[PDB]
Every structure is written in structure tokens, then in C-alpha cells.
From a paper:
Among the two photosystems, PSI catalyzes the light-driven electron transfer from the plastocyanin (or cytochrome c6) at the lumenal side of the thylakoid membranes to ferredoxin at the stromal side. The PsaA and PsaB subunits bind Chl a/Chl a′ as the primary electron donor (P700), and A0 (Chl), A1 (quinone), and Fx (4Fe-4S cluster) as the electron acceptors. Here we analyzed the high-resolution structures of the PSI core complexes from H. hongdechloris grown under white (white PSI) and far-red (far-red PSI) light conditions by cryo-electron microscopy (cryo-EM). We purified the trimeric PSI cores from H. hongdechloris grown under white and far-red light conditions and solved their structures by cryo-EM single particle analyses at resolutions of 2.35 and 2.41 Å, respectively.
In the atomic model of the white PSI, each monomer contains five membrane-spanning subunits (PsaA, PsaB, PsaI, PsaL, and PsaM) and three stromal subunits (PsaC, PsaD, and PsaE). The density map for PsaF, PsaJ, and PsaK of the white PSI are rather poor compared with that of the other assigned subunits, and hence, these three subunits were deleted in the structure. Sodium dodecyl sulfate polyacrylamide gel electrophoresis (SDS-PAGE) analysis of the purified PSI solution sample showed that it contained PsaF, PsaJ, and PsaK. Therefore, the poor densities for these three subunits in the cryo-EM map may be owing to the weak association of these subunits with PSI and partial dissociation of them during the grid preparation for cryo-EM. The cofactors of the white PSI monomer contained 90 Chl a, 16 β-carotene (BCR), 3 [4Fe-4S] cluster, 2 phylloquinones, and three lipid molecules. We found no Chl f molecules in the white PSI but seven Chl f molecules in the far-red PSI. Chl a865 (a865A) is bound to a region in white PSI that is occupied by loop2 in far-red PSI, and it is lost in the far-red PSI. As this Chl is located at the interface of monomers in the white PSI trimer, its absence in the far-red PSI trimer may suggest a different energy transfer behavior among monomers between the far-red PSI and white PSI trimers. In agreement with the previous studies, the RC Chls were a pair of Chl a/Chl a′ (epimer of C132–Chl a) in both white and far-red PSI6. In our structure, PsaA_2, PsaB_2, PsaI_3, and PsaL_2 subunits in the white PSI were changed to PsaA_1, PsaB_1, PsaI_2, and PsaL_1 subunits in the far-red PSI, respectively.
Author numbering:
A (entry chain aA): 44 to 764
B (entry chain aE): 2 to 62
C (entry chain aB): 372 to 741
D (entry chain aB): 76 to 149
E (entry chain aD): 4 to 101
F (entry chain aC): 2 to 81
The structure:
Amino acid sequence: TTTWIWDLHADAHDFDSHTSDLEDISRKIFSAHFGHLAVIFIWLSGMYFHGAKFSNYEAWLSNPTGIKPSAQVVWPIFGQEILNGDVGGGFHGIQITSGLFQMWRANGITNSFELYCTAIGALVMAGLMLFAGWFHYHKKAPKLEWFQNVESMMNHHLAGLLGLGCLGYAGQQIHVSLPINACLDAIDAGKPLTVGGKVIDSVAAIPLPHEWILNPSLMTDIYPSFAEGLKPFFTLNWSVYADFLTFNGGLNPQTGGLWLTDTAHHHLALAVLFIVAGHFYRTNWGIGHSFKEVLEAHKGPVTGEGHKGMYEIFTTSWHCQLSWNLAWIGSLSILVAHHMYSMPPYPYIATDYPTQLSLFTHHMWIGGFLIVGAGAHAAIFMVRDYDPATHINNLLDRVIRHRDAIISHLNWVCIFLGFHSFGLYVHNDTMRAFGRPQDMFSDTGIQLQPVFAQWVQNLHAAAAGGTAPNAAAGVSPAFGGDILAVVGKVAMMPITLGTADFLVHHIHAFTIHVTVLILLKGVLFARNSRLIPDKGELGFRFPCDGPGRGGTCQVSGWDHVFLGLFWMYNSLSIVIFHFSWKMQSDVWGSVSPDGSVSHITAGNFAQSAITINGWLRDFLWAQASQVIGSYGSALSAYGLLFLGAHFVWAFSLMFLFSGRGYWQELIESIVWAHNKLKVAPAIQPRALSITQGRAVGVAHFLLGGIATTWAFFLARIIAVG
Amino acid sequence: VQRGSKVRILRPESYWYRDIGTVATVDQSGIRYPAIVRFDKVNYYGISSNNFALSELEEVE
Amino acid sequence: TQAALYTHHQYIAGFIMVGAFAHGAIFLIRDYDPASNSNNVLDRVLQHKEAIISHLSWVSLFLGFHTLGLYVHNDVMVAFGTPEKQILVEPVFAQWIQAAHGKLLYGFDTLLSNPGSIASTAWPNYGNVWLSGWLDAINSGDNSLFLTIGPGDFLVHHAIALGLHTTTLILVKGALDARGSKLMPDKKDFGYSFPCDGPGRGGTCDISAWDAFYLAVFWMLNTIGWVTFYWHWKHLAIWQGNVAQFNESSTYLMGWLRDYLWLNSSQLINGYNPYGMNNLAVWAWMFLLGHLVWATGFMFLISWRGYWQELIETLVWAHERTPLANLVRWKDKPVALSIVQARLVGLAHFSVGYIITYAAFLIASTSSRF
Amino acid sequence: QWVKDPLNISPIAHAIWDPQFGQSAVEAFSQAGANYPVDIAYSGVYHWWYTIGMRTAGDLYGGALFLMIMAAVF
Amino acid sequence: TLTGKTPVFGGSTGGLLTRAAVEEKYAITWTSTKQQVFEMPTGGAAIMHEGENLLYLARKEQCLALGTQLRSKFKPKIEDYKIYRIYPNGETQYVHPA
Amino acid sequence: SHSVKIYDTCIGCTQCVRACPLDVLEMVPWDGCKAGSIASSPRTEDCVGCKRCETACPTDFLSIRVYLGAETTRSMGLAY
Ligand code: CLA
Ligand code: CLA
Ligand code: CLA
Ligand code: CLA
Ligand SMILES: CC1=C(/C=C/C(C)=C/C=C/C(C)=C/C=C/C=C(C)/C=C/C=C(C)/C=C/C2=C(C)CCCC2(C)C)C(C)(C)CCC1
Ligand SMILES: CCCCCCCCCCCCO[C@@H]1O[C@H](CO)[C@@H](O[C@H]2O[C@H](CO)[C@@H](O)[C@H](O)[C@H]2O)[C@H](O)[C@H]1O
Ligand SMILES: CC1=C(C/C=C(\C)CCC[C@H](C)CCC[C@H](C)CCCC(C)C)C(=O)c2ccccc2C1=O
Ligand code: SF4
Ligand code: SF4
Ligand code: SF4
């Protein structure tokens, strides 16, 4: 039957269902991890090769504020060469929003040859990753006590991968990128190009970065303490180094980005903190802390046996580690989005509004998908790797024993948060339609001021000179300060929080708590419930347990991931809509020579984002005029993909709203017409399974829904920003 | 009948209605459905072997 | 009023037509007698029921592959900047019928537009008293009597034919498989409406004949949606004095999204705004209410029962363990809605949200400028 | 008032009694030449009752009383 | 009317409700040769005793799911479990194995 | 309660009795098949309707059929 065609691709990387023993999965996992690093290196090589052969990168380096970054060129077929829009610099291509150009300029890359060797250099680390996954699997495989040596892994990744990377990048910053960026910020301004023979005048006239290495005399005219050398480092007379290791603390007014002397002292201070942290765990040389002993020490009166069993599952279950590591990488990818818009770390990235919106939105969606996978593999752990003998009266035993207290309280706080966040919006819709604007929740009606967030903003704007005395400016202009403007556009200004920001922040609190509720109910009830006492016997992924007990459709842990994906989609769509409207209304825009900001949507967030009608009219109807009017222009691919993603999202509802018992019976009338005549197959056609129809339905729902926002965001922000 | 004859099935509730099948064994015991018939294609849950009474059956081979 | 009356009686006709097939399937389960009806016309349509369903399946697939393919091809031509490469098939058969009824715009000059044809003169009796009044009204370019149709009217009639055939396909296959199929041969023993037959035999979700009613209401609403979108946009183009806007934009699907849905939403969603409100505020509020009811139906259609039954079990626990509230005891045990019930409740929210969204948009986009 | 000028008078369905209205919603729905909040009828009952011969509110009132005793008969 | 030791368990939120007091109850008794760890059908780990055990559960399906765990998850197998339906008047009907 | 019906095509393979999570079914000596046993359903008032028995039945069509009837506290699987 055709069911085996889909089960072959579904049972591909489920390695611990192929083979029982723990050591042989760990060699397949270790080898496939090399194969995923090679996939990244091939993709990373393509970003540098298309950066070197199909771009306007040096033309962008000459004029960063007036030339759009482009790195994709479209072949002239079928009329499709209209997508090669004039991005400036005599170049016809697709404007890119990934921020590759602003990252390379912060790396000191100036010409296309340094991008070419990085493309080839990434392409040979792809092959050495493919060799190391073949050598460590097919020839000389490691052993399980090396895999379970988690004290040495946490030592060698803290002081190693994190320590020697933060120190090694501080070396790249100080010796290579700090000169060229101090050079490029001089050529960007009119004066001063200080100094020398060559003084510097061209971008190509900037010396190739091995000449900053070979000649310490070149390094001293910009930073005068390089004549003092490596010697006050060993005497700990360290305040002489305050020329390339600064604590300026804010944004460079020339580029808009972070101070690259601050980022070098950032990566240096973390290198010490990571290497110190990498001498924490006990290994062969006697001293240190052990994981297991420090786990069983924390055992208080309220919580039973405490952290017993936590070492055992984190060293014997791959799914327990994967669920926990997905929860933190996804939470970090969300934190990356918040910290990169508001403390923009690349030169000329903050006024590149197509780049700032795309990078916040991309790393939001990556973070939300990986957090959903945390709840998936935590429910897989409970079905497969959970052991009752490991957990008697410890913390994992005691969360299971009060899971009805946990879920019903989370249930109540979700209903409270939905009523007291969304219900305020439809209260406002009704009061505005009634002609009662004084009865609305608004800044001019019944005020809901976010007074705790406004108080935290006051502490962070009054930090420089106060609770952080040795810092010049505050950590970001978003917390308070004055408007920082690169050539005509706002890089960052204070982001005020009024009643409209109180409302949408409690929408975020509501939609995250529901997503937690779906995923935590899937983990805590994966093994059994009062409805299905043997749910762990039926597996992680099964459709139901029949129409009895009233009906038990979607009881599995898999189906909570299925339902959690929709609510993650709902949660993050509002997050990126909150970002896109608040940045266009209150932050981004053009600066006059007099110094007043003309915002992109002209401050309409405070009075329109308090109703659903305002989100429909002033955000969704108004800003979609760029994507539906883009036909016959360079943005016409966004107009086609806007419609095509509307199609795919609607196509998903055939799978989500229907069931396979209809489709199997319709196929019976199709195979009759195939048997009556001709070619009718031997592999007998089936409808998709119940689980696959949900999987197909949620995949096209997520693809069609996210790509609709993608084409809407990019067509809007490229045209108006 | 004879073991190995091709067999047509004439009952509505069967998956293999008017299908041609191969007999595996027949027993003369007196049971309600003595004829094990194998089939070339699986049913909706993978059986390819069902017992039938000869009062339900047609053969051309 | 003319827009409201057409859409009212077409959506009511769509609901009545689906219910005709619903009670035809209930008859085949409850009342049909194969002993009395033995080799009659009604016995015979069930015997070649795989030929009727497979031929409906081919017409649905042929129309959908070629109507959508023609729309997407025209969309790519307009988006690439070449609107003369798009495929514009003239509806020459229905223009000929208009000429055959007395319309002179296409210049065919057959009967009733031929002044000397046999049908126009009505030869042996000459009792053609209606004919002068009819040809006066059918050649007046100011009424809705046999409107001028072009290539935008060709594609949308084949979309309507797709919707008529697919909705019939779901309803006929629900009626003709109501007594049994190969997945469930004894289906008449279980009634018109039942959840499933369990996850065995591959899985049997939505196997009943009631479930094919349930799927066909979706296709009915989509069909009457395509019907009343086309009636409204063609008439709104005529009433605004710009019939060329329909003739240029209805051949690709971005024109339907931009020049019909987006363009005519402007006065509706400004029924209230931060500067005040007007008389369209009730239609603006109903417009958003309809989007809310429609989306609430998706919860009942996508999330299914056993999630909610296990959730209600923790709420039953919390009430019994809460002091001052466990004094209040329910009479009926709280359970989740049944599998059939939430298909019905989900379809009811979907349908109610479908109707009042379009009714708010139809009335507010027409009465704001007229 | 509608039969005197059926081209520019909008028909009235019924009056609005909604106590939750603000005062600018009372003026926004006081339309069709009425000084109380009304709904503009779109069912076509004005165009139908005018064509079949009704002209006054007393005509429709006797029609309303007649369908009430007819409903009581059924 | 039924003897056996209650398993060592701190209690949970998944156990008996008001139905166990006013409508119907269920108990499963079994005899074990070891003091070992088993999973509760209502969630959580408990300690069964050597000798006779006795556990009150809300549904018959929870008792039979525990008896399936007593069969297939222990060395040696535990077949001798008996399931009783307890009514609120005190009448205790032996229902499994019938 | 639900109705569980065992038909004359049962081969006595007892897989439906092993599959039942509520112990509804048991084997009765029958001598109407080669195995001499047939499935029976004495405790149908404890049947939840899960149809795990129908999933295990290897005859085509099924020798055991579950008919979902009037709902009780037992058949709805309620612990409350
Ligand atoms: C480090 C990250 C990571 C790793 C190593 C794994 C690994 C695994 N997962 Mg997990 N998971 C993750 C993250 C991860 N996952 C995330 C982020 C989610 C949320 C979506 C999940 C949710 C999840 C579920 C619900 C399940 C798993 C399962 C599995 C196991 C089998 C996967 C397999 O063989 O499918 C084969 C791979 C495929 C069939 C690929 C399908 C990709 C679909 C079609 C989307 C593609 C969209 C694409 C990006 C868009 C391009 C469109 C274009 C092509 C047109 C394997 C152990 C399964 C399991 O049983 O575990 C024991 C299982 O049921 N995962
Ligand atoms: C606190 C962690 C941290 C932060 C904020 C930064 C910040 C920066 N990095 Mg650096 N870097 C770091 C650590 C960090 N780095 C690590 C761990 C590595 C790998 C070893 C690097 C290697 C690296 C390279 C190669 C490059 C950068 C660049 C940059 C700049 C822009 C891109 C960016 O990473 O966004 C900000 C990132 C975040 C907000 C997320 C932080 C993620 C880390 C893993 C969290 C670490 C955990 C934490 C420190 C533990 C707590 C300790 C204790 C207080 C309890 C920005 C100033 C780029 C640049 O161009 O510089 C100008 C660049 O090319 N970084
Ligand atoms: C717009 C459509 C929509 C709406 C309104 C809901 C509403 C809800 N979902 Mg659902 N959901 C949806 C789409 C929707 N969902 C879809 C498409 C799916 C498919 C994946 C789901 C799947 C899903 C899951 C998996 C879960 C939910 C849950 C919930 C509840 C969250 C708790 C809460 O906020 O209570 C408050 C109710 C609201 C905020 C709704 C609006 C109510 C307004 C403001 C009140 C006005 C009426 C008032 C009572 C006056 C009476 C009027 C009249 C009767 C007189 C809430 C009832 C969760 C839950 O039950 O948690 C407790 C949960 O776990 N839903
Ligand atoms: C916009 C959403 C959408 C679309 C496109 C469809 C499409 C279809 N429905 Mg479905 N349906 C939908 C929503 C939708 N439905 C919803 C919400 C429900 C309620 C649950 C249903 C319930 C339903 C029922 C009950 C039935 C259908 C049937 C059909 C098929 C009708 C025959 C036809 O017209 O063939 C034309 C084909 C299409 C229009 C789809 C093909 C789209 C293009 C051509 C694909 C191109 C290939 C693509 C580029 C490759 C992918 C790229 C890469 C990833 C590989 C068609 C596939 C019927 C059926 O299947 O009979 C045969 C049927 O009985 N539908
Ligand atoms: C399933 C079933 C059922 C149902 C059925 C139905 C529901 C159907 C429907 C159907 C339909 C609903 C049909 C219709 C048809 C119609 C037609 C077919 C018509 C005709 C027409 C014509 C023919 C016309 C023509 C003309 C013209 C056009 C012009 C003028 C002249 C003349 C008049 C000539 C029953 C109950 C039996 C029961 C069993 C089963
Ligand atoms: C999940 C989050 C929880 C959300 C809970 C929301 C509950 C409802 C909010 C009302 C409670 C606070 O509401 C508070 O009331 C007073 C009195 O009207 C408001 O005061 C407002 O209206 C009065 C009218 O008399 C004006 O004089 C005043 O100028 C204006 O600010 C405050 O701005 C508001 O802060
Ligand atoms: C439409 C639909 C189907 C029908 C969809 C099916 C059967 C998928 C099959 C479609 C594929 C694309 C058929 C292609 C067959 C071959 C792969 C094509 C061979 C030719 C290649 C070279 C392209 C279900 O099976 C189903 C199951 C459960 C819930 C909802 C639904 C549901 O909504
Ligand atoms: S409807 Fe489908 S998922 Fe639900 S119980 Fe029936 S077979 Fe299982
Ligand atoms: S009913 Fe089915 S499973 Fe039970 S004994 Fe008979 S053949 Fe075996
Ligand atoms: S439906 Fe479930 S409970 Fe009833 S007999 Fe079958 S397996 Fe047992």
C-alpha cells in the first residue's frame, strides 16, 4: 500500500526506534551532527559565494546609506527578469534582507576576494565535517563513557568552544576589524581621513588586514597604546588599554551600530567569564564540582527527595537532553531578536529597515518552533525513557503527582488572561462604535499605564553616571535618551509604553500561557490520564483510542504538539505584528534637518492598536497596499507569493477539517474506474493516515500562514522603508 | 473443492468481492467456513487470507 | 436592496439544495427497501454508483485543474508586466444565446435578432405581442437584463461549474455510500450520523453519510461565495460607471483581492475609527464579529475531542477540591462535546461567520456609495 | 413619505432602542429623514407593498392585524 | 472484607473523587515476592510490598491497566491479581477474573 | 451500554479477548470452527466502545462488531 511510502520518510531519523542499545544511537547521533554542520557550511559557503560573484557589495561599501544590499540575480526567462530591480550602484538584482553586508563590513571585509576565500574556506570545512562523521562512525567510533563524560564536555565547551571563541573573536576584532572600521568610518565622513602616506582615500586603499598584523606602526596612529605593547597586560596596569577597549556603552552616531571598541571589550570580558566557568567541573585532576553530588545536595523540606534522578535521565536519555536544549536555544533565538533590534550591533543595519524587521521576524519564528520541539521531546521522554524506579518522591515524581493542580491552575490563568487582555480590545471596539471614546481603555480614556515597565525604563535611562558610573551613555536609546539619526533615518529613539503597549503585552502573556498549557498537558499526561490509563502503551504518536469513552481523538502526546503549533503560530504572529506596527509608528522614519521625526505610519499606534478594527484597518488593510499593488514591478514576486501563501493556508483546511474515512471511500470509486480500463497500480492506493493528515494539515497551515506574513512584511518595508 | 483452484467470491461484506484468489487448504470437518483462500492484495488492515463457505463461491478455473 | 435580495435567496437556495441530498441519504438508510424496489430506477442507480461518483470526480478535477491554472497563468502575466500574454477566452456560447434572445451587441444575427427569422415573425399566427417590448428592454444598456459578458465572465462560470460539481460529488457519494462501502460494508446498521468506526482498518474518521453532509456545506458556502462575489462585483462595476474595472481585473485573482475585496472594504472598516463613527459602525462591528465566529469554528474543526475531555477532567478535579465551591455540585457530569456534535458546532460557527461577514460587507460597500 | 419620492428616501426597517449608545451614535443613526435612530430597510418590502397597491400606514396596519388573526386561526 | 497492605505512596491528585464515595469503587489485590517499584495508573511511582497488596482505584480500566503492568513489566510475572467492585453500602463484588 | 456482537465467522483466535482493556470478552467452547472456541461478550455493561477488539480481529469482514448505544458513567470512561 501507499502508506509505506510515507512511513519510510517518517521513520527515517527515529534512530532509537531502529535499535535498542544506548551506545549505538549515540554514535549515529554524533555522526549525523557532523552531517548537519556540513549542511550549514555549504549554506554558509553559498552566502559568501553569492556575496562575491552576484552582488553589489563594494558598491554598497562606498555608499552604505543610499544603496540597497542585493546578492541574488535572476536569469532572463519567461518575463521573470523584472525581479532584477534597480537597487543602486548600477546593479539589477533582488534586494536582500539577511544583513550579510552589514555583518561583513563589521568583519572588516572590503572586497570580493576576501568573500571568495571565505566561501571556499567554508566549502572545505564542509568536507572535513563530512569526513569526521565518516571517520567517527564507519571506522573509529567513540564509546558510551566518553559520551556520558558530561563533566568533561561541560568543561571543554565552557572554557573551549565558548571561551576560545570569544577570545579568538576579540583577536579578530582588535587586530583586524577595529582598524578597518575606524578607517571606514573616516572615509564615510568628509573629514578626518587621519593620517599618513597613504593617508587613506579609497576603500581599496585601506590596507589588507595582514598588514595591520605585519606592521605594528600602522596600528598605533589610531590607537596610541599599541606602542606600549603586550607588557601592561602582564603587570595588570590595565587602564592604559582604554583606546580600543572602551565602555562607551551605546550606539556609534556615525554608523548607528554598536561601538566596535565596546564589542571587543565585551567578547574579551566574556572570554574570561567562560574560561573561569570551564574549570568548575571535577575531572581526572581531583578538584572540582561533580554533577551528581551537587544535584543531591539541593534537597529541601517541601520537595521530597529533591534532585535525585536528574543526573540519571540527563545522562541516559537523549530525548531529555534534546527537549531541554531545544527549550534554551529557542528561548535564546527569541532573546537574539529583542537584543538585535534595540542594540543594533552592525554598522548601517539600524537604518536598514528591511533588514531589522526581517531579522527580528526570522529569529522569532526559529525560536518559537524550537520551543515547541522542547515540549515534543519532553513528551517523548515520558513515553519512552521515563523510568518509575529512577523517580520515587523526587521532583519529577512530585510534578506528576500534582499534575491536576498544575494544569487546572494553568487552565484558569489562561481564561483569566484571555478575558482580561482580548476582552479589553473588544470592549474598546464596542465603545468606539458606540461613540463612547471616553469609556475606552486608552491613553485618553480609562488609562492602563504599564507602570512597572515605565519604572524599569527610568532606571535604565538614568544608569550612565549613576548605577553604572563608568559608562558614557545608556545601554540603548530605546530606554530613554535622544533620537540617534544616521544620514536621514532614525536608528533608535525612545520607545514609549502607553495603554496600547499594556494591552498587547498581556496578549503576549496570554498566548504564551496557552501554548505552555497545551505542551505541558501533553508532557504531564503522555503516559496516562483518568480517561486513558494506558496511554503510554499506545505510544507517543497514535491517532486516538477509538470513538468510545465519548471519543478519544487526539489524546496522544504527538497531537498536543500538533495543537501547540497552531497556538505558537498565533502567539508569534501577534509578536511580529506588535513589532512591525510599533517600529513603523513610533520609532522608524525620516529625520528633518530641524530634528523632528516623521514616522512611517505617523504615530497611529496609540489610538488604533487598542481595537481589533484598528489592527484590521490601520495595520492590516493599510500596510497591505504595497503587496497587492506590486504587480508589474520589482516587488511582484511578493505579490504572487502573497496570493500563493493564501492558497496553501486554505488548502491545509481540507486536511484539518476532514477525515480519512471519507477519502478512502472516494478512492474506492477511483480504483473502480482504474480497474475498469487500464493502468491501475499494484501498490494499492490508500488515503493518508489520521496522523499524517494532521501532519500534512499543520504543515501547509504553518507554511501558508507564515509565508503570507513574509511577503506582506517584505513588500511593505522595502517600499516604505 | 480441489485445492489450488482460482476462486471468485460472491458476498457483499467481503473486501475481495468478485476477486480471484488462490486456495491454500480445505478441510472436511463440518465447520461453517472451511475454505482458506489467499489473495494477491491486502484488505484495509493487511490480511490476505479469509475463510469462506463454498455456498458463497464461484470458480472459472 | 437588489444586492441583498440576490445574495439572500442564493444562500438560502444553497442550504436547501444541500438538505435535499441530506434527506435523500437519510431515506436510503432508514426508509429504502431493496425488496420492494427491486431492479427499478432507484435500485439501478446504486448498482453503477462507482460510475456516477468517478465521473463526477473527473469533471471536478478537470474544471479545477484548468480554471485555477488559467487564473494563475493570468496572474503571472500581470505580475511580470505583460497583461497581453494572459489567456482571455471569450464566452462565445452564452453570447450567442444573448444574440438568440435579441441582443445586437455581439453581431451574430440569428433568431430574435434577425428581424426576418422564423422565430421573430412567428409566422402562421403573428401573435408576437411581447416581442417589441422585449427587444426594447434587452437592447437598453441600463438594466440587468442579459448583461454583456466577456472573458472575466468565462472563467468565473467555470469556477461556479466546479463548485456545483464538487458539492454534488460530496453529496452524491455521501448518499450512494450511505448503506455501505468497502471500508464499512454494514454502514446502514450504524445510522445516518455516527462518529467513525475506530482507528482500525487504516482509520475511519468522517465515514458516515452525515459527515459528507458536513463536508459539502463547506463546498456549498464556497460555491455561493463565488456566485455572489461575481454578481456583486459585476453589478458594483456597472453601478459605479466603470464596467472596464471588472473587465480588466476579473481575469486574474489579484484583481479580485485588490479591486473587489480590498477596494470596497474602505468605507466599511471606517464605520468607526479614532476620529468618530457613522451609520456603518454596526456593519463594521458585525464584520469583525463574523470574522470572530468563523475563526471560533476552526477550534471545533481542528482540535478534536480527547484533548478537551482530558482538560475537563482537571477542571472537574479543581472544582471538587476547591473549598466554598465544592458546596455547589453539578447535576450533570461535565464532559467534552461529542465527535459529531463539534463537527456540527464547528460548521455552525463557520457558516454563521461566513454569512454575517459577507452580509455586513455587501450592505456596507453598496450603501456607502449608494 | 417614501411613496412620494421612492428614489431618494431611504426606507426605514424599524427604530433602534439600544441604551448602550453614546450620543454621537444616536445622531449617526438618526437618518432617512427621521429624528430617532433607525435602520435602513434592505429587504425590499417597501418596493413590494408599493407595487401591490398599499399607500398609507393605515393600509399596512390593517394588513398587520389581519395576519395576526390569521396566525391565531392556524 | 479485603486485606492487603496499601502501597507506599505519598498520594496524588489523580486518585479517587466523589464518585468513589457515592456511586462505585474498585480495588485490586495482588501478592508479590519482592518490594519493588511500580507505576500508578493515576500517575506516579509507588512501592509494592512483599505479601498481599491492596489498592483502591476509581475505574475498572485503571485496575486492569495496573494488572497488565503486573503481568508484563515484572520478573517474575504477577498473574494472581483480583479486582473487586465496591458499592457505597459496603457490598464488594469480585469482578475479575470472572 | 454498548452492544458487542460476535458473528459465526469467528476463527477462535482470541486476539479480541487479549485486546480488550475492560475485560468485556471471553472465549466459549463452540465446535463451530477449527479452534472449537468462539468469542463472547458477557460484561457488555463495562464496555467503553474503544473498538480495540475490532482492530485485533483478523477475519474479513470482522467477526466482532461494537454498536455504540446509550451512554452510562462506565461507557463514557468517567472517573467522576
Ligand atoms: C535539534 C532539533 C531536533 C532533532 C534532532 C529532532 C529529532 C527528531 N524528532 Mg523532533 N522536533 C523538533 C526538533 C528536533 N527534532 C522541532 C523543532 C519540533 C516542532 C516541529 C519537533 C517535533 C517533533 C514531533 C511531533 C516528532 C518529532 C520526532 C523526531 C525524531 C524523528 C524525526 C524524523 O525522523 O522525521 C523525518 C523528517 C521529516 C519527515 C521532515 C518533515 C519536514 C516537514 C515536511 C516540514 C518541512 C517544511 C520546510 C522547512 C519548508 C520547505 C518547503 C518546500 C520543501 C516546498 C527525531 C529524533 C518524531 C518522533 O517520533 O520522535 C521520537 C515525532 O513524532 N519531532
Ligand atoms: C552574552 C553573549 C554574547 C553577546 C550579547 C554577543 C554579542 C555580539 N556578538 Mg558575539 N560571541 C559570543 C558571545 C556574545 N556575543 C559567543 C558565545 C561566540 C561564539 C564563541 C561569539 C562569536 C561571535 C562572532 C564570530 C561574531 C560575534 C558578533 C557579535 C555582535 C553581533 C551579533 C550577535 O551575536 O548578537 C547578540 C547575541 C545575543 C544577544 C545572544 C547571546 C548568545 C550567547 C551564546 C549567550 C551566552 C550565555 C551567557 C553569556 C551565559 C551567562 C553568564 C553569566 C552572566 C551567568 C554582538 C555585539 C559579530 C560581530 O560582528 O561583532 C561586532 C560576529 O561576527 N560574536
Ligand atoms: C478566534 C477563534 C478562537 C477563540 C475565540 C478561541 C477561544 C479559546 N480557545 Mg481556542 N483554538 C482556536 C481558535 C479560537 N479559540 C483554533 C483555531 C484552534 C485549533 C488549533 C484552537 C485550539 C485550542 C486549544 C488547544 C486550546 C484552546 C483554548 C481556548 C480558550 C482560551 C482561554 C480563554 O481565553 O478564555 C476566555 C475566552 C475568550 C478570550 C474568547 C473571547 C470571549 C469574549 C472576550 C467574551 C465575550 C462573550 C461574553 C461571555 C458575553 C456572553 C455573550 C452571550 C452568550 C450573551 C478560549 C475559549 C485553550 C483552553 O481551553 O484554555 C483554558 C486551549 O488549551 N483553543
Ligand atoms: C483553497 C483550498 C482548497 C483547494 C485548492 C481544494 C481542492 C480540492 N478539493 Mg478540497 N476542500 C477544502 C479546500 C480546498 N480544496 C476545504 C476547506 C474542505 C472542507 C474540509 C474541502 C473538502 C473537500 C471534499 C469533501 C472534496 C474536496 C475535493 C477537492 C479537489 C477537487 C477537484 C479539483 O478541482 O481538482 C483540481 C485540483 C486542485 C485545484 C488542487 C491542485 C493545486 C495545484 C494544481 C497543484 C500544483 C502542484 C504544486 C505546485 C506542487 C507542490 C510543490 C512542491 C511542494 C512539490 C481539489 C483537489 C474533492 C475531491 O478530491 O474529488 C476528487 C472532494 O470530494 N475538498
Ligand atoms: C440522492 C438521493 C435523492 C436525492 C436527489 C436529489 C436531491 C436530486 C436533485 C436533482 C436536481 C435538483 C435536479 C434538477 C434538474 C433540473 C433540470 C434538469 C431542469 C431541466 C430544465 C430544462 C430542460 C429547461 C429547458 C428550457 C430552457 C433552458 C429555456 C426555456 C425552454 C426550456 C424550458 C426547454 C433522492 C431524494 C431521490 C433519494 C435517493 C437518493
Ligand atoms: C491581566 C491584566 C489585568 C487587567 C485588569 C483590568 C481591569 C479594568 C481596569 C480598571 C481598573 C483601573 O482603572 C482606573 O480607573 C480610573 C477611573 O476611571 C481611570 O481614570 C480615568 O477615568 C476617569 C473618569 O472618572 C478620569 O477622571 C481620569 O482622568 C481617567 O484617567 C484610570 O485611568 C484607571 O487606571
Ligand atoms: C485530501 C485529503 C486526502 C487525500 C490526499 C491524498 C490521498 C494524498 C495523495 C496525493 C499525492 C500527491 C498523489 C500523488 C501520487 C504519486 C506520488 C504521483 C506519481 C507521479 C510523480 C512522478 C509526481 C487524505 O488522504 C486525507 C487523510 C486524512 C485527513 C484528511 C485528508 C484529506 O483532506
Ligand atoms: S474520529 Fe478518527 S481519531 Fe476520532 S476516534 Fe474516530 S477514528 Fe479515532
Ligand atoms: S472475534 Fe475476531 S479476534 Fe475474536 S476470536 Fe473471533 S476472529 Fe479472533
Ligand atoms: S469496544 Fe473496547 S471495551 Fe468494548 S469489547 Fe471492544 S475492546 Fe473491549
